[PDB]
From a paper:
SARS-CoV-2 utilizes a trimeric spike glycoprotein for attachment to the host cell receptor angiotensin-converting enzyme 2 (ACE2) and for the subsequent cell entry step which involves the fusion of host cell and viral membranes. Given its crucial role in the viral replicative cycle, the spike protein represents an important therapeutic target and is a critical antigen in host immune responses. All emerging variants contain defining mutations within their spike proteins, with multiple mutations clustering within the receptor-binding domain (RBD) impacting both ACE2 binding and antibody neutralization escape, while mutations within the highly antigenic loops in the N-terminal domain (NTD) across these variants reduce antibody neutralization. Given the rapidly changing mutational and antigenic landscape of the SARS-CoV-2 spike protein, a structural understanding of spike protein mutational effects and the discovery of broadly neutralizing epitopes is of importance.
To identify structural mutational impacts on ACE2 binding we next determined the cryo-EM structures of variant spike-ACE2 complexes. Focus-refined structures of the ACE2-RBD interface enabled visualization of RBD mutations, revealing local structures which are identical to our previously reported structures using spikes harboring variant RBD mutations alone. Superposition of local RBD-ACE2 complex models revealed no significant structural changes. These structural findings confirm that mutations outside of the RBD do not modulate the positioning of ACE2-contacting residues at the receptor interface via allosteric mechanisms. Our structures of VoC S proteins in complex with ACE2 demonstrate minimal structural changes in the RBD, reflecting its functional constraints in cell attachment, only permitting mutations that preserve the ACE2 binding interface.
Author numbering:
A (entry chain E): 19 to 614
B (entry chain B): 330 to 530
C-alpha cells in the first residue's frame, strides 16, 4: 500500500539476493588471495562483475522509492545507501575514462621501478626499496637520491593523470548533489534526521582543525626532540631553527615515524619489552598465537571464534608451491563466515597483528544480526579503531606477564615507560599532522581553493606550516609529490586514520574507566573485565544502524570526537619532552634554513 | 506380550531427501508401536524441544495418530519453529499453533544438504498477503503484489516472486547451515488410540 511498506519488501528481497551474490564474490576473492592462479583471477573477475552489475540494477530500481515518504530510520538508511548513483550518473565515455585512469594509476604505482642512473641492469621495486633503504639507511645522499628519483618518475607520470582525475571526480560529485569530491568523502560522517545527534559535512573540517590545534603542542615538542636526535645523527644537514628534511623521517613519505625509534631512543641502555625470544623458547605456533588472542577476547566477554574460522582460515604461509598475498587481512565473507588471512611468523608484531585482526573479526561478527546493507562500521574510523584498541591492550606488560610471555620479575620503571610511550608517539602522534595536511590539501584541491599551477607551492607551504617538514630541493609543477602514496593514487579516503587515532584513545579511556583501572592510561589492560566488553559490545552490535555520534555516546558519553584521551595517554611523555626541550627550541621556522 | 510392528521412524529421520520448508512433508503414522526413547537417547539431534508433553513419559502414553512434518531450514530459523514465535518461516512458511502438543527435533545437516557449488534445491516462501494458519501448506507460485499496480504474471516493479532459495554452502556459518527439522504432532481424538508405546514385560 504505502511507499514505506513497498520499500521494506524491496529491502527484504534485496538482502536475501545480495547476501548470496556477496558470499560468492567474497569466496572468489578469498580463493584468489590464498591461491594466485589465472583461473582464480578469472573467477574473481566474473564474480565481481556479477556483483557490480547486480548492485547497478538494484541501485537503478531503488531510486523509484522517494526518500521523503519514509519515516523509519533504518529503512531510510538502507535506501540512502542503495540509492547512491556512484559513477553511474556520469556519462559512459567519461565513466570509462575514469575507470581507465584509476586502473592505469594502480599499475603505475604498483609496477613503478626506479634505479640509479648509469647502472640500469637491475632495478628496485616499491617493496624492496621501502623495507631496506628508507627504513634502515643512515646516508643522506642515498636517501635523497631514492626520494627524489621516486618522486621524479612517479610524479612526472602521474601528474596529467591526476589532473584528469580531479576534474572527473568533481564532475561526478557535483552530478551527485555534492559540492566537490571532498564533500563526497566527508559525507561518510554526515548524520541527518536525528534530533540532537545531527552531524554535518561542513562540521568535519572544523572539528579536525579544533582537535589538531590541541594536537599541536605535543607534536611540536616531539618534533623538537626528533629534530635534536636527527641533528646528532646527521651533523650539518638539520638546522636548530628550521624544519626537518623530508627524506630523513624513516619512511618513504613521512607517514609514520616508527623507523626512527633506534636513532631517537631515550634510554638505549634499558631493555625493550620484546617477547619474541620467549615465544621461540616455548615453541609458540601461530595456532597458539590465535588461541591466546581468542582467550583475550573471551576474557573480556566477547564471543569466541567459530568452527569455520579455525577450519577455513590460513594462519601460516602455505609454502613455495602455492602463492598467497602476505598482507594480514580479516575477511567477513558473509553468510556467517569469518576468516583471517595472515602469514603469521613468531614475532611480537605478528602477535599484535593477530589481536588487531581478531578485533576486526569480532567487530564483523557483532553486527551479523543487522541487515545486509547496514553491516559495516558506523563510520570508517570505528572499524580500524576497534582493532587498534586490542593492539593497545595486548601490548601492555601486564598482559604479557599474565599470559606468561614476560618474566614475572621484570622491573617496570619510569624509563621503560618513557621509551615505550615515545615509540607509540612516533607511530601514532607522528602520523596525525601528515594525515591532516594531506586531507586538507586534497579537500582544497577538490574545492578549487588551489589552482593547478599552484598545487606544489601551496603543498610545501602547507607541509612547512603543519607538518614542519621542508623539501630537500624545490619542486616545480611537473612533479606530482602527493600521488606517490598508495591511498591518494588509488582513490582512497585518508581522514579515517585521523579519526581512528582519536577514536582509539576515546574508546581506551571509556573501557579503562569501565574496567576500573586506577593507574596511567598506557598501563591499562581490559582483560578479565566483563563490563568493559559489555560497553564495547553495545556499540559493536549496532553496526551502521545508528549514527556514529550515538555510538560514541554509547561508549564514551560524548557526541563528538575528542582529543583529551590522546593527550592524557601521552601525558608522562609530554612532561618528559617538556623537560628535555629546555635548551633546545620548540617549534619550527618555515624559512629555508636547514636546506633548499 | 511379545511386541513387534514398530513405527516407521527410519523413513522419516533417515530419509535420503527432505522437502522444502514451504512444501513441507506430512506423514501420518498410525497402527504401530512408537518407541520415542530411541529418538530421545540419540546424540545426533541438536534441538529436541518438546511442547505440551515431556519426553520421559512419551514412551508410556498412547495417541490416536502421529503427524511427522519434515522440512529443511537455516540454523537461525530453528527458533521460529515454536508456538507464538513470529518470523518469515512462522508467518509465511510453517506455522505452529499456540496449543501445540508435540516435539520439534532439529539437527545440523551441513554434511548432506550442502555442496561446494551451492545447493539451491531448498526453497522458502518470503512473501504472502496474510500469515499462515497453523498446519497450513501453501504451494502456490502466484506473483506477490506489493503495490497497487497489477502484476500481470511478470516480476516487474513492486511485484516479486514468492519462493526464494537458500544458498547452502559447506563453509557457511552455523547460523546459515542447513538444519533438518522433524516436527511430531500428537493428538488424542475420540477414535480408538492406536499409536502406543512399547509395554514392558
Ligand atoms: C591451489 O590452486 C591449484 C591450481 O590447480 C590447485 O591444484 C590447488 O588444489 C589449490 N590449493 C588449494 C588449497 O585449494
Ligand atoms: C523499522 O523497520 C524494522 C524492520 O526493518 C522494524 O523492526 C523496526 O521496528 C522499524 N522501526 C520503526 C520506528 O518503525
Ligand atoms: C541517480 O541518477 C539518476 C539519473 O540522472 C537520477 O534521476 C537520480 O535522481 C539520481 N539519484 C540520486 C540519489 O541523486
Ligand atoms: C566457544 O565457547 C563455547 C562456550 O564456552 C564452547 O562450548 C565452544 O566449544 C567454544 N568454541 C571454540 C571453537 O572454542
Ligand atoms: C624516574 O624515577 C626516579 C625516582 O623517582 C627519578 O629520580 C627519575 O628522575 C625518574 N626519571 C624520569 C625520566 O621520570
Ligand atoms: C584473567 O583470567 C584468567 C583465568 O580466569 C587468569 O589466568 C588470568 O591471570 C587473568 N588475568 C589477569 C591479568 O589476572
Ligand atoms: C538414522 O541414522 C543414524 C546414523 O547411523 C542411525 O544411528 C539411526 O539408527 C538411524 N535411525 C533413526 C531412527 O534415527
Amino acid at each position: 500500500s504505502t511507499i514505506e511498506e513497498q520499500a521494506k519488501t524491496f529491502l527484504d528481497k534485496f538482502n536475501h539476493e545480495a547476501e548470496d551474490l556477496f558470499y560468492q564474490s567474497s569466496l572468489a576473492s578469498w580463493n584468489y588471495n590464498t591461491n594466485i592462479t589465472e583461473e582464480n583471477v578469472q573467477n574473481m573477475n566474473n564474480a565481481g562483475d556479477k556483483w557490480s552489475a547486480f548492485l547497478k540494477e538494484q541501485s537503478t530500481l531503488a531510486q523509484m522509492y522517494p526518500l521523503q515518504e519514509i519515516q523509519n530510520l533504518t529503512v531510510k538508511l538502507q535506501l540512502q545507501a542503495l540509492q547512491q548513483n556512484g559513477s553511474s550518473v556520469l556519462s559512459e565515455d567519461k565513466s570509462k575514462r575514469l575507470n581507465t585512469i584509476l586502473n592505469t594509476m594502480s599499475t603505475i604505482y604498483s609496477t613503478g621501478k626506479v634505479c640509479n642512473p648509469d647502472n640500469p641492469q637491475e632495478c628496485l621495486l616499491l617493496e624492496p626499496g621501502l623495507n631496506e633503504i628508507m627504513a634502515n639507511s643512515l646516508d643522506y645522499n642515498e636517501r635523497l637520491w631514492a626520494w627524489e628519483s621516486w618522486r621524479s618518475e612517479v610524479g612526472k607520470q602521474l601528474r596529467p593523470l591526476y589532473e584528469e582525475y580531479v576534474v572527473l571526480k568533481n564532475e561526478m560529485a557535483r552530478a551527485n548533489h555534492y559540492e566537490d569530491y571532498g564533500d563526497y568523502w566527508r559525507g561518510d560522517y554526515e548524520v541527518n534526521g536525528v534530533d540532537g545527534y545531527d552531524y554535518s559535512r561542513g562540521q568535519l573540517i572544523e572539528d579536525v582543525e579544533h582537535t589538531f590545534e590541541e594536537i599541536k603542542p605535543l607534536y611540536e615538542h616531539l618534533h623538537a626532540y626528533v629534530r635534536a636526535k636527527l641533528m646528532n645523527a646527521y651533523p650539518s644537514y638539520i638546522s636548530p631553527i628550521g624544519c626537518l628534511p623530508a627524506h630523513l623521517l624513516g619512511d618513504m613519505w613521512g607517514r609514520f615515524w616508527t623507523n626512527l625509534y633506534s636513532l631517537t631512543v631515550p634510554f638505549g641502555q634499558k631493555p625493550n619489552i620484546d617477547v619474541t625470544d620467549a615465544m621461540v623458547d616455548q615453541a609458540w605456533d601461530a595456532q597458539r598465537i590465535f588461541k591466546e588472542a581468542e582467550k583475550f577476547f573471551v576474557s573480556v566477554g566477547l564471543p569466541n571464534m567459530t568452527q569455520g574460522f579455525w577450519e577455513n582460515s590460513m594462519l601460516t604461509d602455505p609454502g613455495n608451491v602455492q602463492k598467497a598475498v602476505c598482507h594480514p587481512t580479516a575477511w567477513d565473507l558473509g553468510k556467517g563466515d569469518f576468516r583471517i588471512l595472515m602469514c603469521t611468523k613468531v614475532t611480537m608484531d605478528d602477535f599484535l597483528t593477530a589481536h588487531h585482526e581478531m578485533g576486526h573479526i569480532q567487530y564483523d561478527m557483532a553486527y551479523a544480526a543487522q541487515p545486509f546493507l547496514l553491516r559495516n562500521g558506523a563510520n570508517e574510523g570505528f572499524h580500524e579503531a576497534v582493532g587498534e584498541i586490542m593492539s593497545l591492550s595486548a601490548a601492555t606488560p601486564k598482559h604479557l606477564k599474565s599470559i606468561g610471555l614476560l618474566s614475572p620479575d621484570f622491573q617496570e620503571d619510569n624509563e621503560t615507560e618513557i621509551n615505550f610511550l615515545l615509540k607509540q608517539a612516533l607511530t601514532i602522534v607522528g602520523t596525525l599532522p601528515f594525515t591532516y595536511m594531506l586531507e586538507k590539501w586534497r579537500w582544497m584541491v577538490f574545492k578549487g581553493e588551489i589552482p593547478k599551477d599552484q598545487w606544489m607551492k601551496k603543498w610545501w607551504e602547507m607541509k612547512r606550516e603543519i607538518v614542519g617538514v621542508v623539501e630537500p630541493v624545490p619542486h616545480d609543477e611537473t612533479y606530482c609529490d602527493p600521488a606517490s602514496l598508495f591511498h591518494v593514487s588509488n582513490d582512497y579516503s585518508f581522514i579515517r586514520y585521523y579519526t581512528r587515532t582519536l577514536y582509539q584513545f576515546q574508546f581506551q579511556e571509556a573501557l579503562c574507566q569501565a574496567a576500573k583501572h586506577e593507574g596511567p592510561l598506557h598501563k591499562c589492560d581490559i582483560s578479565n573485565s566483563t563490563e568493559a566488553g559489555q560497553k564495547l559490545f553495545n556499540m559493536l552490535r549496532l553496526g551502521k544502524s545508528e549514527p556514529w555520534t550515538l555510538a560514541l555516546e554509547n561508549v564514551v558519553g560524548a557526541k563528538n570526537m575528542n582529543v583529551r584521551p590522546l593527550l592524557n595517554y601521552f601525558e608522562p611523555l609530554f612532561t618528559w619532552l617538556k623537560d628535555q626541550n629546555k635548551n633546545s627550541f620548540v617549534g619550527w621556522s618555515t624559512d629555508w634554513s636547514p636546506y633548499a | 506380550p511379545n511386541i513387534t510392528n514398530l513405527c516407521p521412524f527410519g523413513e522419516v529421520f533417515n530419509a535420503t531427501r527432505f522437502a522444502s520448508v514451504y512444501a513441507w512433508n506430512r506423514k501420518r503414522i498410525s497402527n504401530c508401536v512408537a518407541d520415542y526413547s530411541v529418538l530421545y537417547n540419540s546424540a545426533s539431534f541438536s534441538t529436541f524441544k518438546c511442547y505440551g508433553v515431556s519426553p520421559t513419559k512419551l514412551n508410556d502414553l498412547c495417541f490416536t495418530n502421529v503427524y511427522a512434518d519434515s522440512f529443511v531450514i537455516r540454523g537461525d530459523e530453528v527458533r521460529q519453529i515454536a508456538p507464538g514465535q513470529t518470523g518469515k518461516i512462522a508467518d509465511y512458511n510453517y506455522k505452529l499453533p499456540d496449543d501445540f502438543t508435540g516435539c520439534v527435533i532439529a539437527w545440523n545437516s551441513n554434511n548432506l544438504d550442502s555442496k561446494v557449488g551451492g545447493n539451491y534445491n531448498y526453497r522458502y516462501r518470503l512473501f504472502r498477503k496474510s500469515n499462515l494458519k497453523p498446519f497450513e501448506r501453501d504451494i502456490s507460485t502466484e506473483i506477490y503484489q506489493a503495490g497497487s499496480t497489477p502484476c500481470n504474471g511478470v516480476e516487474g516493479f513492486n511485484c516479486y516472486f514468492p519462493l526464494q532459495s537458500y544458498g547452502f554452502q559447506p563453509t557457511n556459518g552455523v547460523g546459515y547451515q542447513p538444519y533438518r527439522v522433524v516436527v511430531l504432532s500428537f493428538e488424542l481424538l475420540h477414535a480408538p488410540a492406536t499409536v502406543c508405546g512399547p509395554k514392558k514385560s
